[PDB]
Design a protein around this ligand. Sequence first.
Ligand SMILES: Nc1ncnc2c1ncn2[C@@H]1O[C@H](COP(=O)(O)OP(=O)(O)OP(=O)(O)O)[C@@H](O)[C@H]1O
Ligand SMILES: [Mn+2]
Ligand SMILES: [Mn+2]
Length: 330
Amino acid sequence: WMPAYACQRPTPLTHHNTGLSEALEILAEAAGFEGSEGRLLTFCRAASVLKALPSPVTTLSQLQGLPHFGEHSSRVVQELLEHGVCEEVERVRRSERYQTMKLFTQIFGVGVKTADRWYREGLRTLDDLREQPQKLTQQQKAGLQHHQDLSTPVLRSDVDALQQVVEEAVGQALPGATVTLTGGFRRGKLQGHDVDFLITHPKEGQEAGLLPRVMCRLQDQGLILYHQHQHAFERSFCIFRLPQPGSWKAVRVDLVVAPVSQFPFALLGWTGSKLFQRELRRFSRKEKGLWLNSHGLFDPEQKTFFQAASEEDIFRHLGLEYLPPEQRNA
Ligand SMILES: Nc1ncnc2c1ncn2[C@@H]1O[C@H](COP(=O)(O)OP(=O)(O)OP(=O)(O)O)[C@@H](O)[C@H]1O
Ligand SMILES: [Mn+2]
Ligand SMILES: [Mn+2]
């Protein structure tokens, strides 16, 4: 009754199974920390099925017929229904390995391989990292400097203020250039870990050199704490200093520039969710023989690229019913 791929079904922002999906996602995350990519994807998929259900799962009977609910994920839900707690999940939560890997990987500029390296070298705390500055990139140093603020959920109100200053800077640098909110906030999330913006201009090539001008403008207003510009799309992964009444908050902001020919692919890729996009790309390759990414949709047999004006165009070309961003919360 429910389709196998996350991109074939709506997944709304709010759902009836948050306890169960959260528990499965702890196990997915822990698997990724150990390099167990298959196990990660398996738990992620099961959690996403629960998100798409129209009712709470009260009894294990309601598991019947559902895709991606193998033995292990079923046992986890069974323990939660019967005992209110799953021993395996609680052991993961209490473990020093999991707690440390979560601590490190949530730092700006730190991935799983870096976090694991540090773990294996005997580092455990944020102070441990500050004691070894030669082990840190400039990005990671900035992440540590602002870690309290960067751990604080970003709110819709923060997003609105940030979009205003980014739009002002973009508009003053280049009349006609546009700013589009992407990421989780485009999917309707009330809170997030950063804010993602996609910048373009309707005339191909007019976007050249725009981002550095935008950054200069923001820097001169005192709004930038950290900036790493990289000429993949031109992008700037930043920490903004967001003014607030009587104080200020550091906030992570990703700015991406795409040429307008690629904008639909970029918007689709950058809107997520991460699992939704993984599933959409797996679907495109496996079911339709096409390779999808943030730049385009390629037929490797014909050596052709699909011309899309909208996300809707891309869904249609892949034979999928269109899902608006708020239904991509897989
Ligand atoms: N810094 C980044 N580097 C690479 N890709 C990114 C980055 N930020 C966003 N994306 C892309 O945009 C989508 C959103 O990514 P992001 O990590 O911001 O998660 P999110 O869905 O916005 O949720 P939240 O940011 O609240 O955790 C993903 O599909 C990803 O491909
Ligand atoms: Mn985001
Ligand atoms: Mn981001």
